[PDB]
């Protein structure tokens, strides 16, 4: 069976179901992969200087390595042994109740004050006759730091005191999930579990992955190093 | 209609008066965007960018497009006119004409040169039959391999003219020599004449294959261009 | 509509780019996000790659990334086309008596011409240089 | 046009450009398709293209009335235009591909440095490239530069204090100034879009911001000036990305006399001295040339080996094949002389021309050597006797083929009409190549055979 | 002016050598783009210390304001160019300069949390009790952003 | 194998009486105990 | 859902059909738009 046509036919039917699925499941992103069940290799990542935690290493791999490896031909699936950072708003129920607020008020405030607004242009088309100025209008942009999320205004009290998001929650950069935690010889580590795409040559794909990892190594922060704790391809190469 | 959009109700006042959409806005049919202003000799202009379909004839398509636009002429409003600022088919028509002219002129020149040296019309007719048979054969191999009639394939055969013309001259001239030198009848003269060149002609085919075939094994954009000349010349030479 | 280069990049371009995984024979990927509210992501593939298989694999990964895009971008929609192709000819349509605007001509070409040219023998694709009519509500803030 | 230039100003330049082409070049130009607001480099109100359509080639005699001549006159004439970079240029042979002359460099942000730091790293590379005019030429950004943009900050406290929702504020601004696609309607049985937007005159200048009002929860109308503050800042009107990472495309070409390969070698060396976290890669034509370049040596080797092997089997000798293979230069010298004289380039048509010229000269030589060898083997003739008897027999057919083919490609050389550039490239290289290939071979082929046979008395 | 528009480009780009040649030829130092930014505005924005000094030596208006009332000191303070803030203030930059929003160099310096520039501005007599259109002082910004260090510096 | 799980019943009558929205209850319970993906932000020039 | 044959033809059938141009080996295209709001566009291709 042609895995390309198999994927297209499966997805064609998945797209009939997609709209009926809960909004939370759609926004998490549904994926359709054509890969083997077993891992081709595990690309380990450690910090020899020990200046990056398991959580720091996982974020860097997810942010600067995973996507380029996922786009490489022969790579059917990539499992991050760890999680990419998210803006974690750790809510306090005692503080929320104190100011008569709920998680609903917190979610509404974040959507309103962490917004990327399309505000148009000065002297935009169609313009009036004799217009000399054309400039983009920039309104609210996405927040970049825990500090900016901290000073999100939830409400103002009767006396005129401000209730900020940091008054009802602790705000830090933390993994999307906290399920997967990896180690390499007892040392803090992350990595990529790579599955071979249906039909693709294992050695050709392994070579393509090594070529892509070689383009990342130069721009690594101090201490960060690639290790090869699991690879099935060397056996195939040496056995032949 | 703009009338209906104008009659859209926004608010009913305390006195009982009605606020419509036409009371707080100008309503008209306009463009989706006003970013692009298109003019043709200072006059308001639109147009259609037409691409050729896979395996289609450019000259037949352009004729069919003009034929369809002719049927639309009567239904055009007053002042509306069709103009052809960009058209590639007049260039393609000249390319085919000039290449057919070159191949015809080449066969005429061989006829004149054949008569100048050999001085008998019976001998001058053998190339006149052979060359068209080889050229026609080339198109059959060209079609079979899934190639098209294009600038690169057409000039490919023009560059091969010398090799096709030579195969014709070499075979006939050698027989005319053997007859003139040994006084053998045409049939017995051809047996001996071919017996002197048959081994070389087969060898020449393999040498020219070694020169041209590897040119088709270049990769990327350059490879695709070189493969057009390679397949056309090797096909024409092989049939010759 | 009405979005700056950064808004387009951070909400559309980056979200689509991150979902362009598991596509076969991809050489490289480039994109640009401009102040006219436009993004174009060009995925270039190995020579001898089926352009149909390449387009549908890109299309399929985009479809699953559509719920991650803004409401206004989902509403406008996201086009996936083979861009490597070139034009056979350009048919220009003009108004000489100055009774029609470029909007008026574009609407007529879209309504009365484009479809018929698309069905013409040997025509592989037809692109309109302009847009069909749109209902324009030009608001007045003094009256509002 | 300069940064922040309006649509009206760009039209004035396009009108001048259009006016010029229909005045100074009315005998050549048929029409001018003036597209205001579009550019291949980037879009905006400060960009535009004018597609010039010419009359039939029959009504434009001599180089004086050709694209190259009009282009030069146009480019020079438009040098006078103030606050605009206006110049004409011819289309590439294959419009499917780009210019396909020079290199295509991608400067990559590999460690989230941001737009500003990548601009500084680009300017650094451009400055260092400019210090080598002898190697690099016209090393420029392909994209656009940062422009002034109107930053407006909505005070969240003031909005909540007056009872004005942020959705109503951001919709009022976005809808008015940006435009909003509401829903679809049906115009004469065809579904079309409905757009709400401010009437031009109320969304032009920063003063117009304060003319827009938003209703609060208590029903009071509050102007934008009450809960907003504005300042000027710089931002990108066109942000580029390459392989998921922020990038900036840099175009350039090798200086006169220098190869593109050597020009890339330096661009790599200059790039290695850029700030930490600034990488690079080769795209488009550059990506193609590097892979195509690696294959060339191996394909030459295979081609040159099989030629020898085929001739070795034909003649039954490891030595004699060399007598044939030595004719290759005799045809190539003529092509180069004809090309350099007429002022043409080493293009595909010229290169394929050399192979067919080499092929026919090799064929002429093969038959002379075959005849010469067969006379020595069968009729037991001496080396010189057989060689002289061979060239004698092979003289007439070589002259007949050469005379016919040289005259056959004569019209392609002198052609100055439509698609003459391709014809000239095909004709010039072949004619000159055939003249030398014919004249030299008839004298040099017997020399090659005698010298090779004398050297190697092995068989 | 022709050279005026080359100076604007030169000052922005940070092309010290080209600005030198322009000042000699007499390029208009009071040249302004559509938004009303002088070469000094641009030089101060992008952080070109050498060009700021050269332009001020060639009679550039230190208290020049754009179409929204912002000065080079506003830009220098906001984008954390300490050296340029000192040079501008020594050449007589208005330390209590209000834009159209009532925002000052101190407000902008406080918002991005530039401690050195805040103290430099306060040393040259920056009004710490200066209120914007929303009645907010540099202190009100510091406590809202949660900057303890800056809050301690701003005790009048 | 099956495991102990914490079953919680929302009394519709009591919620309607107190004037407590069922959407507010489900969101409060879901967001706090399960987590809620609100929207995206930019961490060093990357959408997260 | 709820759309008549005329409404769904103008908003769906005609919108899809006008984009079904330049498909390889397309012999003919038949479609129907009914009062249930259902659209079916059948494209028949060359043998092989
Ligand atoms: C030497 C012996 C072998 C002969 C080799 C001949 C070279 C091969 C070229 C064959 C061309 C095939 O394509 C042929 O081209 C002619 C023009 O030349 C086209 O003819 C065209 O004429 C005009 C062009 O304005 C149109 O009105 C017409 O509709 C169109 O078909 C046809 O589309 C097709 O019949
Ligand atoms: C019937 C007679 C006619 C036969 C003529 C045609 C023969 C077939 C041609 C096969 C084409 C080979 O294609 C070529 O293969 C070689 C493998 O050695 C590849 O490999 C090449 O890579 C690099 C180049 O620096 C080197 O390490 C290697 O020595 C070189 O050979 C080329 O990248 C590829 O372009
Ligand atoms: C089988 C051999 C036929 C090869 C046909 C032509 C190959 C294309 C190579 C080519 O032009 O690319 C290189 C580049 C183009 O920009 O520059 C060139 O054109 C350089 C060509 C060098 C030729 C050296 C001859 C070696 C003798 C043994
Ligand atoms: C790949 C080998 C090609 C070499 C061609 C050999 C042909 C010469 C045959 C000689 N003959 C059998 C006719 O006497």
Author numbering:
A (entry chain A): 98 to 337
B (entry chain B): 242 to 481
C (entry chain B): 50 to 193
D (entry chain B): 578 to 1036
E (entry chain D): 12 to 167
F (entry chain A): 722 to 769
G (entry chain C): 50 to 97
What do the study authors state?
Efflux transporters of the RND family confer resistance to multiple antibiotics in Gram-negative bacteria. Homotrimeric AcrB is comprised of three protomers that cycle interdependently through the loose (L), tight (T), and open (O) conformational states during H+/drug antiport catalysis. Characterisation of resistant E. coli mutants and structural biology analyses indicate that the compounds bind to a unique site on the transmembrane domain of the AcrB L protomer, lined by key catalytic residues involved in proton relay. Thus, our work unveils a class of allosteric efflux-pump inhibitors that likely act by preventing the functional catalytic cycle of the RND pump.
Here, the TM helices show subtle differences in their conformation at the cytoplasmic side, leading to an expansion of the narrow channel between the D407, D408, and K940 residues of the proton relay site and the cytoplasm, thus allowing for the accommodation of BDM88855 (9). The quinoline moiety of the inhibitor interacts with surrounding hydrophobic residues, including V411, L442, I445, and F948. The piperazine moiety is mainly surrounded by residues involved in the proton relay network (D407, D408, and K940), as well as L449, and the carbonyl oxygen of the main chain L404. The carboxyl moiety of D408 and carbonyl moiety of L404 are re-orientated compared to the apo-structure to allow the formation of a salt bridge with the protonated secondary nitrogen atom (–NH2+–) of the piperazine moiety. Furthermore, the D407 and K940 side chains are re-orientated to accommodate the piperazine moiety of BDM88855 (9), (normally, K940 occupies this area in the unliganded L protomer). This re-orientation disrupts the H-bond network between S481, D407, D408, K940, and T97813, while maintaining H-bonding between S481 and D408 in the BDM88855 (9) co-structure. The presence of a halogen atom in position 3 of the quinoline ring is required for inhibitor activity and correlates with the formation of a halogen bond to the main chain carbonyl oxygen of K940. Therefore, the inhibitor likely interferes with the proton relay site at the TM domain of AcrB and appears to lock the L protomer in this state.
